[PDB]
Automatic annotation (TrEMBL), chain A:
GO terms for biological process: heterochromatin formation. GO terms for molecular function: DNA binding; protein heterodimerization activity; structural constituent of chromatin. This is Histone H2A. Residues 1-73 form the Core Histone H2A/H2B/H3 domain. The keyword Zinc does not apply. It comes from Xenopus laevis (African clawed frog). Keywords: Acetylation, Chromosome, DNA-binding, Isopeptide bond, Nucleosome core, Nucleus, Phosphoprotein, Ubl conjugation. Core component of nucleosome. Nucleosomes wrap and compact DNA into chromatin, limiting DNA accessibility to the cellular machineries which require DNA as a template. Histones thereby play a central role in transcription regulation, DNA repair, DNA replication and chromosomal stability. DNA accessibility is regulated via a complex set of post-translational modifications of histones, also called histone code, and nucleosome remodeling. The lineage of its organism: Eukaryota, Metazoa, Chordata, Craniata, Vertebrata. Belongs to the histone H2A family. It is found in: Chromosome; Nucleus. The chain holds residues 17 to 102 of 130 of the full protein.
Amino acid sequence: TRSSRAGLQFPVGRVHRLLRKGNYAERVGAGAPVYLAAVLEYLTAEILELAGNAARDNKKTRIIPRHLQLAVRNDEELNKLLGRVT
Amino acid sequence: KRRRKESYAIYVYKVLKQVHPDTGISSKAMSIMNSFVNDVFERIAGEASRLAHYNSTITSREIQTAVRLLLPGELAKHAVSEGTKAVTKYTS
Amino acid sequence: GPVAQGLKEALVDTLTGILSPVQEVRAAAEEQIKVLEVTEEFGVHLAELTVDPQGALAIRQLASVILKQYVETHWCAQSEKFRPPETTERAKIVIRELLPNGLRESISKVRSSVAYAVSAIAHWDWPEAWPQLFNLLMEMLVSGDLNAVHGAMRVLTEFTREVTDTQMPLVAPVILPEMYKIFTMAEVYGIRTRSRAVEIFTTCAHMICNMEELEKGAAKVLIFPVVQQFTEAFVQALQIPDGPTSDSGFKMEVLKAVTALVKNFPKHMVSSMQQILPIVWNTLTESAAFYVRTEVNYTEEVEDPVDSDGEVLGFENLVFSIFEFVHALLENSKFKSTVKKALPELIYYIILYMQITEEQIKVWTANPQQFVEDEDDDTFSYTVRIAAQDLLLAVATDFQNESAAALAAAATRHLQEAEQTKNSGTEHWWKIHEACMLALGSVKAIITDSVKNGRIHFDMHGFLTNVILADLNLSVSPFLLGRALWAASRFTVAMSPELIQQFLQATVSGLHETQPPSVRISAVRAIWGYCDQLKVSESTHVLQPFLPSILDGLIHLAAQFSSEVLNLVMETLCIVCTVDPEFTASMESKICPFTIAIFLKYSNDPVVASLAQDIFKELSQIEACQGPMQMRLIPTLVSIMQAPADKIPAGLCATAIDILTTVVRNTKPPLSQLLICQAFPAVAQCTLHTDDNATMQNGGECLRAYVSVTLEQVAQWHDEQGHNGLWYVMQVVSQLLDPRTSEFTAAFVGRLVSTLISKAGRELGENLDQILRAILSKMQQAETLSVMQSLIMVFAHLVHTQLEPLLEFLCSLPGPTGKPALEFVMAEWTSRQHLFYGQYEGKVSSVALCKLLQHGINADDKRLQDIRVKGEEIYSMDEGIRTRSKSAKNWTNIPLLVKILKLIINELSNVMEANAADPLYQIDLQAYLTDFLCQFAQQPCYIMFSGHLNDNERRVLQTIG
């Protein structure tokens, strides 16, 4: 229900514990996992949308690793984002 | 190869069925998504962590900031739009 | 056709030519096939040559090798490593009709290649272009030809990983029953084939898990009834000793399948756990005994008196899967109780797995850098030893008190058994001491806390004396001696004064060059631990007499090692400098020349430069060091800043400036002529002549430090031309705000301008306007938040000191707009206020907005009122994730004062959430904002302001009144 009242599919609870269980900080607000979870969820929706778009553009019904690859590279911002994160 | 710690597959799958309800995802593609989500988390958790000293207490402000240090252009704007909408409904 | 039959004879001729000893025929055949590759039926002919069972093996082998590579590179035009031409629909149909029969081939190498090619095709063609592939492979399994099942199973491993939720309802019910037959018929099918059956089970289960936890009713109908039969078969197979029907790799796959079911279908396997746990426990303990005999204490040089047909492959990977199974139980709210109950025995066997192996001894002795890297707490290495240690840290974090009592009982037993082993003449008895000391030190906080509060039975003083101290005076292995120095430093809090004296003495002895590198490295870590713990405890007095010998030991070690050992010595040298400032000052004459030499020698390495910088910082903060070190360090920094940019390594100059800034920031004015007449000009000149953004920014922060610390001396200094210090600051402020250069040149200029205005400003007062015009022109170019915040903060500061002149000035020019510059500043400021970061920068901006709002109301300053800005984006709550594409397929404009009121309410929200988890510094922002809003809500203007607030903003106001 914690993710449900945040309108999120991704798990606010588990994100909260991953933050606490890490040597990141010694205090974390209830609003941090909510925000971060929505961001993680927003990014996967953006990648899945473009990767599924590419799969649909080849009249395929399954996303495969090449479709994720095309979605990222053929989008300037997602390409820019994945270079700094890798 | 210690303990790609978390498994977000079931949640990646839910989000997939909202943007493309009739499209599937293969095992290797899902594993890549899970690695990606795990990486973006550890990077936002690195910036938002080092920044808590410039401001040691992480909240919706310091991950929103680390989200803008890291995301470029519209990805950063929409991310903050989806993030702030979550916290708003979460506190309603 | 006749041309295809001749193009195939050409292929055969080229293949036979590639298989010839005469290099001429092979070099020609190479150029030939470079052209045949572009033929339409190239792959078709290769497919025929490979599948037909009567051809020559040397041809079939070759056609299959090239067939695999052809399909990998030509089958899909959207492939990454695509090579034209794309296989035509005509050719694909033929090749798809052709290869399946080749999976029945008697020869293994050919059957495997045919299978690899079939999997490559299915990746692209299933289910749209090859709808019959699944029904086709199932036929091969049940045919009865054992070559058909080997080929089909080798394809089904990859195929099932291609199946999605859409097709799984049609694949899982069919294939899993056949995987059960193959898995349980150990007398018919080989180990590798039954192992592939487990792979396919685990793959289907992962997919079914995704579907089930989205919409319940997918796991009852597809796998749950067969989970019972499989789990039962898995536990039966886990008890099979290595032989004709089982080996480590196979047992690993079974265990991973069981672990996958525990993580994905826990509620459904509660009924079977009573059977699984004892069996995996037998696997855990037996594998420990086998690991210790075959890895830990195995000497390769010993010849067996009796030969065996021995293959024990992938045993290390089985061990890992055992730990993973335990982690799975630990991560379940219902199953973790069984680990908690088993901690004494579990931790006993964990310690066996943690022992140093003979191979590890070989590597670490040969490469001390690996020793530093492998034995770091944040190491990326993954070994049985490290994995075992991680499992210990997990149970110790989840069951703090039960782990302390369990680890005490485990170590006590191990040490008892180790005394017996030692008296039997066994050389490697010490490995149990080393592993116990490692274990206890890894979780030192829970052992000392439980011993202090008398919760556990453990002779701490006996452990320190009879194990740790005793082993320091033994000569059995440098890795025992080194582990003891480390372990002692972890238990500093539990040591008697007599012990801390002996252990510090032993640590200094551990540094000397007569010791092997691992010992000296261990001693360095130990010294770091002592300095860190005795500072926190305010007990550094016991450490003071050892500092002279420690310092000499660290400096001497740095002269013999580079790379990671040196970084460790530099980190430890730095913390040593913070123990006794009196001592550090008396040893400045050697610390500072040493650090400078390191700084320059490894000038190409930023990690060392930053560590050198950390030491310089600690010296700069000690008054008695400043004079002597500056005469030493400043000439070297100046040398760096005047050196040509293309000739010194990247970042050295920027770090040199930061070191200088730290000196200036910490020296009380007046500053030496060394800092004013040599350093200040060099840094100003370096900043004005550099093309590097990092140097420029640091240069400005350095001049800002000069202006902030000793404005008088900056003014009274002149060059030969008459230009004074404030002249150079102005020129730098000009270059940083230059709209023609990068945006980032102004990333920190805001601080310089604000400090310059705060200190001088009046002095050369016409310049102020020229700077503000430059700021505005720079904001037009700037797009990044950090830069914009730096600039906008200049005007935010002026709101507190020159509110009316600011509004007057900003309304007096258009700026880079067709509107008053005041419209431009407030438009950019209000649209970014919600992103500003900084506790200080937040207060300045927050109350500045309150004062802008308070002035625009108490007065009728229509320069503020008449302005309109962006307000909010109106989004629906019953819509999913708003992606960028959803934003182009579809913002309010409101009075400035309304937008400002909202930003203030937002700053209150963020400050409330942060707590619930200029001299303005001391004001409680939450109290001030709370005070401002309550008084604001009662003014008559609030009536129409409230109507503009949204639900979330109104909620925040009800929280306060």
